[PDB]
């Protein structure tokens, strides 16, 4: 087409979606990761994760307001990935990289799994 | 912080939100612009428009599944802006610029109003 494009638009949209999350505005699901609860927007979760895409496109699960993750999932790993979904920034540290990579494999976040594998390879 | 950032994340999120819109997945509102109807996600509309942000943060209006816009609003202008919200690309043409600018002023989309004003100034 003959469109013009605003370079910062996608980043500005994501920043505003994170502001809505902060302020608990229009959050429509609670993700339970053992004893912890995380509120989020189903659409953002589906846009970032192959697992949430599969869950919320299912005719029965799309209607659930609470999703319980596998008990092996680490809440801190999930929290780091949820922050990544809403900001593009990944808080990857020597002390959390294994939990983050395991969580990203479970959530089907291929770009995160890729950077974790590279950082692990560099340490070996 | 000591975060790493995935450059293409925000663009990839927006592309997936537009794919959900295309496939009518988890759309939760219908915007009526005279005889036309547009399905969308309330969160994306709020993230892009000062008017939708004000509407869906209102304790009564946040619960509505149908929003009727002012009858003076042009459906094609709205359609062009809705596509911009979901893609960052604005289909601005000599034949639609006045309707697009009027719609962007009503929707409170300051960056769009800015580029329309500049394109109009260049023609004068």
């Amino acid at each position: 087409d003959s469109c013009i494009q605003f370079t910062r638009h996608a980043s500005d949209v994501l920043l505003n979606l994170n502001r809505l999350r902060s302020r608990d505005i229009l959050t429509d699901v609670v993700i339970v990761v053992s004893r912890e609860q995380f509120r989020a927007h189903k659409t953002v979760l589906m846009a970032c994760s192959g697992l949430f895409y599969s869950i919320f496109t299912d005719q029965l699960k799309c209607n659930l307001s609470v999703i319980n993750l596998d008990p092996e999932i680490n809440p801190e790993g999930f929290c780091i990935l949820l922050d990544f979904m809403y900001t593009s920034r990944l808080n990857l540290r020597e002390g959390n990289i294994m939990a983050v990579m395991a969580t990203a494999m479970y959530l089907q976040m291929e770009h995160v799994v890729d950077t974790c594998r590279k950082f692990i390879k560099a340490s070996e | 912080d000591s975060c790493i950032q995935f450059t293409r994340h925000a663009s990839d999120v927006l592309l997936n939100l537009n794919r959900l819109r295309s496939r009518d997945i988890l759309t939760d509102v219908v915007i009526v612009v005279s005889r036309e109807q547009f399905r969308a996600h309330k969160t994306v509309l709020m993230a892009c428009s000062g008017l939708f942000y004000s509407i869906f943060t209102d304790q009564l209006k946040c619960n509505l599944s149908v929003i009727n816009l002012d009858p003076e609003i042009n459906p094609e202008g709205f359609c062009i802006l809705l596509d911009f919200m979901y893609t960052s690309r604005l289909n601005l043409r000599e034949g639609n610029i006045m309707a697009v600018m009027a719609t962007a002023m009503y929707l409170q989309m300051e960056h769009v109003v800015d580029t329309c004003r500049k394109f109009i100034k260049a023609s004068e």
């Binding site: 469109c3 013009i4 494009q5 605003f6 | 604005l90 580029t115």
Partner: peptide, 4 residues
């Protein structure tokens, strides 16, 4: 704004 840019030409994409």
């Amino acid at each position: 704004w840019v030409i994409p």
